[PDB]
Amino acid sequence: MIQRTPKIQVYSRHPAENGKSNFLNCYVSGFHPSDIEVDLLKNGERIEKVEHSDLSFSKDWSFYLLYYTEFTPTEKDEYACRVNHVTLSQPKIVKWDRDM
Amino acid sequence: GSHSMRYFFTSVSRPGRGEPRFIAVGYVDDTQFVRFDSDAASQRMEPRAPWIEQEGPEYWDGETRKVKAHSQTHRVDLGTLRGYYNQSEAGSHTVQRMYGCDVGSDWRFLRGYHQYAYDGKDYIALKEDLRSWTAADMAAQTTKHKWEAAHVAEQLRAYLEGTCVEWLRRYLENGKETLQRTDAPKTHMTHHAVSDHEATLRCWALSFYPAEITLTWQRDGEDQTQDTELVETRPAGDGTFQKWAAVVVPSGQEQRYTCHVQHEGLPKPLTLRWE
Amino acid sequence: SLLMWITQL
C-alpha cells in the first residue's frame, strides 16, 4: 500500500531574536500513513513539552502536522526536529537554521 | 473574495490495539475552528477558534452528536472495505473523508464536494453536478450503485447547496475580525555567500493570510523557475503563513535578479531587488 | 455545521 515520506521544515514563528520569546515549529507534511513520531531537540535532547496541531490532510490525501513549543532562542543553543515514519530507515534529523 | 468550509475526517484501524482512531477537523478558509478526537477525554466536538466558542450548548451538543455518528459510520466502513479488498484483520488501514462548500464574493454557492479515500487513494467522490459519482476502481463501482439506489447524492446536494453555505455565512459574520481579514505578507531578502563567487538570495514572505501566495524570481525579467528553490507554504502557528524562494546568484549579478510577490492582501504585486 | 448523518458504504 501507499507510503509517502514526510517533508520536514523546522523554523521559528517570528524572526529569531536572542533573548526574545518565540515558538519553535516543525512542520511535517506530505506523508502517508498517518503514524509518525516527531520530536523537537534542544542541544540534542528531546524537549518535553511539545504540542501538535490536529491531524488534517491535503487535496492529495497526504497528511500534515505542526509540532511546536515555546522557546527563547540564544546565540549558542542548537535546535532540531527528529522525525520517524515507516518510509524512513532511520529517523531524519533536520537542524534549525535561523534563516530557513 | 471567495470562501470555503471544509470538514476533514481520518479513521485508522488499530487491530488488537483497541477501537479505530477517529479525528475530525473543520476549517473556514485556512482557519481551523473545530476538532474531535476519539482518543481525547472530553468525547465532545471542541472549539479551536475563539469566534465559535460563544456558540451555545445547542450547537456543541448537536455537533457532538453528529460527529460521534460520523465516527460510527467510519468504524463500520473500515470493516466493509477490509472485506471488499480481501484484506486480513491484522493490518492497520486508513479511511479519509472530506466534504464542504465554496461560496463566491457575494457569499453565494459556487461548488460542493464530498470525497472519500481508502489507504491514501481515491475510493469514491461526488461529481461536480452533485448528482453522480466517480468510482475510482471496481470495488467502488459497487458503492456507486448502492448509493445511486439509495439516492445518497440528493441528501448531500441539499446540505452542500443549502445548510453548508448558510453555516459558512454565519461563521464568516461571527469570525469577521479573523476570517474576513487579509494580512499582506511582510517581505525581506537574505544574502549568504555560499562561496567567494556565489551568494544565495532568499526572498521571504511572513505573517500573511490567507495561505495562497506566489513567489517567483526573475533574472533580467526572465522567469527562473527551474533555478528557484521554493518551499511549501507553512503555518506560523498564530494563524498566519510563511514561505520563501531562493536563487543562487553569481558574482556581482545581484542587481539582475528580482523577487515577485503576489498575494490577495497586496494592493499591487511586489517587485523586490537586492539594491 | 456537520451533515446530519453520513451513509455507510
Side-chain angles (χ1 to χ4, degrees):
Chain A
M1 71 193 57
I2 290 287
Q3 298 181 342
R4 302 182 183 299
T5 320
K7 298 168 282 207
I8 300 167
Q9 297 193 65
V10 58
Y11 58 103
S12 55
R13 175 179 300 183
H14 304 274
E17 301 172 276
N18 289 336
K20 306 193 180 188
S21 58
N22 208 324
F23 279 81
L24 178 64
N25 295 328
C26 185
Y27 180 60
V28 289
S29 63
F31 63 97
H32 218 286
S34 62
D35 284 354
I36 194 164
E37 190 159 297
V38 178
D39 301 314
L40 298 175
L41 310 180
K42 179 184 187 176
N43 299 317
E45 296 297 347
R46 177 175 56 84
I47 299 170
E48 290 279 356
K49 177 46 182 30
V50 177
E51 303 189 83
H52 60 87
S53 62
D54 304 316
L55 184 72
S56 193
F57 55 83
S58 300
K59 181 184 194 302
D60 66 5
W61 305 110
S62 65
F63 293 104
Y64 64 82
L65 289 171
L66 179 62
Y67 285 75
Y68 57 94
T69 192
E70 303 187 350
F71 80 137
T72 296
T74 62
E75 185 182 353
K76 286 180 185 36
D77 287 320
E78 294 173 6
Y79 292 90
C81 177
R82 174 173 62 195
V83 171
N84 198 30
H85 188 258
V86 71
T87 56
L88 306 171
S89 66
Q90 54 183 129
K92 178 68 165 169
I93 298 167
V94 179
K95 295 188 181 178
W96 179 50
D97 184 359
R98 56 160 86 202
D99 209 349
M100 304 170 75
Chain B
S2 301
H3 296 279
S4 67
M5 183 175 68
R6 294 277 198 280
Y7 286 100
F8 297 88
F9 311 86
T10 305
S11 203
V12 185
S13 66
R14 303 186 282 192
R17 303 184 205 175
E19 237 54 32
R21 186 63 176 283
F22 184 69
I23 297 166
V25 299
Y27 285 78
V28 172
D29 298 328
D30 301 315
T31 299
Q32 194 188 336
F33 74 103
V34 289
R35 75 161 167 214
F36 177 85
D37 170 12
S38 64
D39 281 4
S42 76
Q43 294 300 300
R44 294 199 50 100
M45 185 81 103
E46 294 172 62
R48 296 289 275 162
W51 48 261
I52 197 84
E53 282 192 315
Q54 323 136 28
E55 292 301 285
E58 189 44 48
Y59 184 82
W60 297 110
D61 282 2
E63 298 303 295
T64 296
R65 189 170 299 122
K66 293 182 285 177
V67 83
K68 290 180 170 168
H70 282 52
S71 181
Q72 296 309 290
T73 294
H74 273 47
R75 184 174 72 152
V76 177
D77 285 356
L78 280 150
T80 303
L81 286 162
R82 195 185 83 249
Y84 285 171
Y85 292 99
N86 292 131
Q87 288 164 337
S88 34
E89 209 165 2
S92 177
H93 291 86
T94 305
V95 174
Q96 286 163 273
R97 188 193 298 255
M98 182 274 294
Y99 64 75
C101 55
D102 297 345
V103 298
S105 56
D106 58 5
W107 293 6
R108 287 187 68 166
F109 175 84
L110 221 44
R111 189 168 160 160
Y113 314 73
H114 178 105
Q115 294 164 202
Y116 197 97
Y118 185 52
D119 291 330
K121 296 182 270 313
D122 286 347
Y123 180 76
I124 198 181
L126 197 60
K127 290 192 149 74
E128 207 184 343
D129 65 6
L130 309 186
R131 302 165 41 248
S132 55
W133 302 92
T134 298
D137 61 13
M138 194 60 67
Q141 292 177 28
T142 281
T143 302
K144 177 168 181 176
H145 306 329
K146 201 140 141 191
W147 287 0
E148 292 170 344
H151 309 281
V152 170
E154 286 68 27
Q155 275 151 34
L156 292 183
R157 189 180 228 212
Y159 168 80
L160 289 167
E161 307 190 331
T163 309
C164 185
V165 282
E166 291 166 6
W167 284 101
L168 173 53
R169 283 184 271 198
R170 180 180 166 80
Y171 299 149
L172 290 166
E173 68 186 47
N174 298 160
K176 182 181 189 203
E177 175 157 352
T178 314
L179 297 166
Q180 296 184 242
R181 83 183 198 277
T182 49
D183 302 351
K186 295 183 210 155
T187 61
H188 77 282
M189 227 177 258
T190 67
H191 186 286
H192 188 282
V194 190
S195 64
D196 84 325
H197 65 283
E198 271 162 8
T200 306
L201 287 175
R202 181 168 292 107
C203 190
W204 282 93
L206 305 169
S207 197
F208 60 92
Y209 181 86
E212 168 72 29
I213 193 163
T214 307
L215 296 183
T216 57
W217 278 100
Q218 290 174 19
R219 186 181 62 187
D220 294 355
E222 299 181 339
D223 299 82
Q224 298 295 293
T225 305
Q226 298 171 315
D227 295 294
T228 302
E229 176 177 27
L230 195 62
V231 293
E232 170 169 35
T233 300
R234 67 201 197 183
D238 61 353
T240 68
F241 295 87
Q242 310 177 347
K243 196 188 188 73
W244 61 255
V247 287
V248 162
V249 306
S251 307
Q253 286 179 225
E254 283 96 340
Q255 79 287 350
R256 301 183 70 188
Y257 288 78
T258 47
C259 174
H260 297 263
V261 183
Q262 299 167 261
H263 182 90
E264 186 187 352
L266 292 170
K268 270 93 102 69
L270 296 165
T271 297
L272 303 63
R273 194 191 302 272
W274 191 272
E275 277 20 87
Chain C
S1 176
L2 291 172
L3 201 46
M4 210 88 83
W5 69 88
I6 31 67
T7 294
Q8 284 164 206
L9 299 173

